[PDB]
Amino acid sequence: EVQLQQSGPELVKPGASVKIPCKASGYTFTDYNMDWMKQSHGKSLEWIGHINPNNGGTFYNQKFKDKATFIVDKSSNTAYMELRSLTSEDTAVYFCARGGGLRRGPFAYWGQGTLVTVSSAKTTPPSVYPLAPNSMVTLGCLVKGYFPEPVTVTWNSGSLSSGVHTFPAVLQSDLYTLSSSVTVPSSTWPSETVTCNVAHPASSTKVDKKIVPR
Amino acid sequence: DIVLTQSPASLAVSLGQRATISCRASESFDSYGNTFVHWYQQKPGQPPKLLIYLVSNLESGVPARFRGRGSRTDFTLTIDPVEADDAAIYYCQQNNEDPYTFGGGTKLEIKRADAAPTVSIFPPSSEQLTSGGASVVCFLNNFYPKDINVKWDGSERQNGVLNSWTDQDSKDSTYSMSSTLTLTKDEYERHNSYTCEATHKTSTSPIVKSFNR
């Protein structure tokens, strides 16, 4: 099956550049364009341009001429988009998508998106605090005082996901805080084990906080 | 460029009913060949996902609840019947002319029966206490509709109260929210009862959770 796989989130200083990979598999890479999109937070998408991997050719949305460069590594079926002279206006999710081959068409296959945050603020890992307290029981995980976004949260590595609510982070005094609840039967907890799995890619934090009965 | 204006900006549609989402091009597209207008569904934190391509063709794997039509400058996505899984933002897109462009998006809310929140309060964990910090957390889970009010020792305090709503759940069409009252160590240690009362149009009486310390 077709897969487009992008890099993880990126914190970049103002004025610097970043390069975003998009690795393709499940089809013959040189048959199709690779297109690139930008989506600012809370906003619609903008098409940056595309590259023809077969022959190296490119077309840029004029608006992105001073911002984006496309290249491909035919050798590894990886398309790349470089963004230069970064400002806060470039903070956004960037997506690759497979484009036209023999003729124009829709974007049927997309990469997962990569978040680029432009800031010169320092990186701060979160503290992960457990929350302990009735046929059902709700348990929590508090992820506090981090920068930048994102963190990811799972419960028992994703096997337990059915009664999870993970709340969007709030920015406070230059720091994000996020929470996440989970609800399971009384019979299963505190009887057997529940832990939240928290990662903060920007600091390489990966914590497992077990929910201990108080 | 060719500007695509979507209508409505938002709508709320009951389960089983019809949602009509419009896209208007700033100028007409050209009759030589096909018309490259496509429709996508996008949920939070995901790429958009293709529904309809070349105005009216159904992408394989997409159910026939989704239909596209149009011509020249007017294009229509219909979702009938609407289901819980449709809670999303929808976009039209054109690649008839450079640069390619997307509509501004239409946010579909699923309207369902009103639902009271389940409310849980949590005192700060001792791990957090060892760091000289005290946060008291309240979860308000699986309610409808979205509009909701929450109030946190006998009396009240809004200073240090970070709130946060989820998007619409795509299985049961509910919303959840999370209120975190945070305050200092010797400040927290200095009090008694902590209550989150929440009020919501599912009842007269606020739902009250609390603990003594």
In angstroms, what separates the C-alpha of B80 from chain A's closest C-alpha?
Answer: 22
- For residue B211, CA distances in Å to A44, B158, B196 come to 44, 18, 10
Helix (H, G, I), strand (E, B) or coil at B59: coil
Give the Cα separation of A120 and A125 in Å (integer): 16
**What backbone phi and psi angles, to 5 degrees, belong to B36?**
-90, 70
With DSSP H G I counted as helix, E B as strand and the rest as coil, what are the percentages for chain A, rounded to 5?
10, 50, 40
Closest B-chain CA to A96: B47
A176-185/A164-166 β-pairing: antiparallel
CB B135, CB B128: distance < 8 Å: yes
CA distance A91 to A121: 14
In B, which residues are within 8 Å of A177 by CB distance?
A: 162, 180
Residues 6+ apart with CB under 8 A from A60: A48, A49, A68, A70
Phi, psi (degrees; rounded to nearest 5) at B136: -110, 125
Nearest CA to CA, how far is B36 from chain A (Å)? 7
- Cis preceding linkage at B48, omega within 30: no
User: For residues B52 and B209, what is the distance between their CA atoms, to the nearest angstrom?
Assistant: 47
- In the three-class reduction of DSSP (H, G, I as helix; E, B as strand; rest coil), residue B187 is classed as helix
Non-local (6+) Cβ contacts of A32 within 8 A are A53, A98, A99, A100, A101
The C-alpha atoms of residue A43 and residue B48 are separated, in whole angstroms, by: 13
Say if A106 is an interface residue toward chain B (CB within 8 Å): yes
Please give the structure tokens belonging to residue B138: 């309240």
Q: Is the peptide bond before B8 cis (omega within 30 degrees of 0)?
A: yes
Q: How many residues are present in chain A?
A: 214
Element (H, E) at B130: helix B126-130
Partner B contacted by A58 (CB < 8 A) = no
Q: Name every chain A residue with its beta carbon within 8 A of the beta carbon of B54.
A: 105-106
Could you tell me which chain B residue has the CA closest to the CA of A128? B128
DSSP A55: T
Out of 3.90.1580.10, 1.10.3720.10, 2.60.40.10, 3.40.50.620, the CATH code matching A121-214 is 2.60.40.10
**Breaks in chain A listed by the residue before each, with C–N > 2.5 Å:** 133
Task: Report the residue of chain B nearest A179, measured CA to CA.
Answer: B178
DSSP state of A214: -
DSSP strand pairing (B106-111 vs B149-151): unpaired
The upper half-sphere exposure of residue B87, i.e. CA atoms within 13 Å in the direction of its Cβ, equals: 19
- Do residue B54 and residue A105 have CB atoms under 8 angstroms apart? yes
Q: Residues of B with CB below 8 A from A62's CB?
A: 99
What's A158's DSSP letter? G
Cβ(A52)–Cβ(A36) below 8 Å = no
CATH code assigned to B1-112: 2.60.40.10
| Region B113-213: CATH code | 2.60.40.10
Dihedral, B95, B92, B172, B58 alpha carbons, nearest 10? -60
Measured between beta carbons, the chain A residues lying within 8 angstroms of B102 are 44-47
Encode A10-40: b = buried (16+ Cβ within 10 Å), e = exposed.
bbbeeeeebebbbbbeeeebeebbbbbbbbe
By three-state DSSP, how is residue A96 classified? strand
Name the nearest CA neighbour of B61 among A109, A86, A58, A166.
A109
Asked if B128 contacts B134 with a C-beta cutoff of 8 angstroms, the reply is: yes
Q: Count H helices, E strands: chain B?
A: 2, 18
**What separation, in Å, do the N-terminal and C-terminal C-alpha atoms of chain A show?**
48
Domain boundaries, chain A: 1-120, 121-214
First and final CA of chain B: distance in angstroms?
Answer: 63
Domains B1-112 and B113-213 share a fold: yes
This structure was determined by X-ray
| A103-134 core/surface letters (b: 16 or more CB in 10 A; e: else) | eebbbbbbbbbbbbbbbeeeebbbbbbbbbbe
Handedness of CA A95, A106, B15, B25 (dihedral sign): positive
- Specify the resolution in Å: 2.3
| Contact call for B40 and A169, based on CB within 8 A | no
Domain ranges, ordered by start, for chain B:
1-112, 113-213
DSSP string, B99-111: SPEE---EEEEEE
What's the Cα-to-Cα distance from B39 to each of A122, A163, B27, rounded to whole Å?
40, 31, 18
State which H helix or E strand residue B188 sits in: helix B185-188
